[PDB]
Amino acid sequence: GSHMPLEFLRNQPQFQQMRQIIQQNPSLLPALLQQIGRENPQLLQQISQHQEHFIQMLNEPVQEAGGQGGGG
């Protein structure tokens, strides 16, 4: 979508968890892109086509106080 690239990630059981790892070891961002390449190389090449926007969805916290219903 025009305000959400890679939208198929947004709720996934791995996307709930792999970002928590990178938020403690950003040195393993390469090692997570490589890990996606061992099980979904089709997702990997799609993330690679959007990498600057993937980092925005990747670097945020997996939960936030806005999850109660909205931003205000």
From Swiss-Prot:
It is found in: Nucleus; Cytoplasm. It comes from the Eukaryota. Coiled coil: none annotated. Residues 5-47 form the STI1 domain. Multiubiquitin chain receptor involved in modulation of proteasomal degradation. Binds to polyubiquitin chains. Proposed to be capable to bind simultaneously to the 26S proteasome and to polyubiquitinated substrates and to deliver ubiquitinated proteins to the proteasome. May play a role in endoplasmic reticulum-associated degradation (ERAD) of misfolded glycoproteins by association with PNGase and delivering deglycosylated proteins to the proteasome. Component of the XPC complex composed of XPC, RAD23B and CETN2. Interacts with NGLY1 and PSMC1. Interacts with ATXN3. Interacts with PSMD4 and PSMC5. Interacts with AMFR. Interacts with VCP; the interaction is indirect and mediated by NGLY1. This is UV excision repair protein RAD23 homolog B.
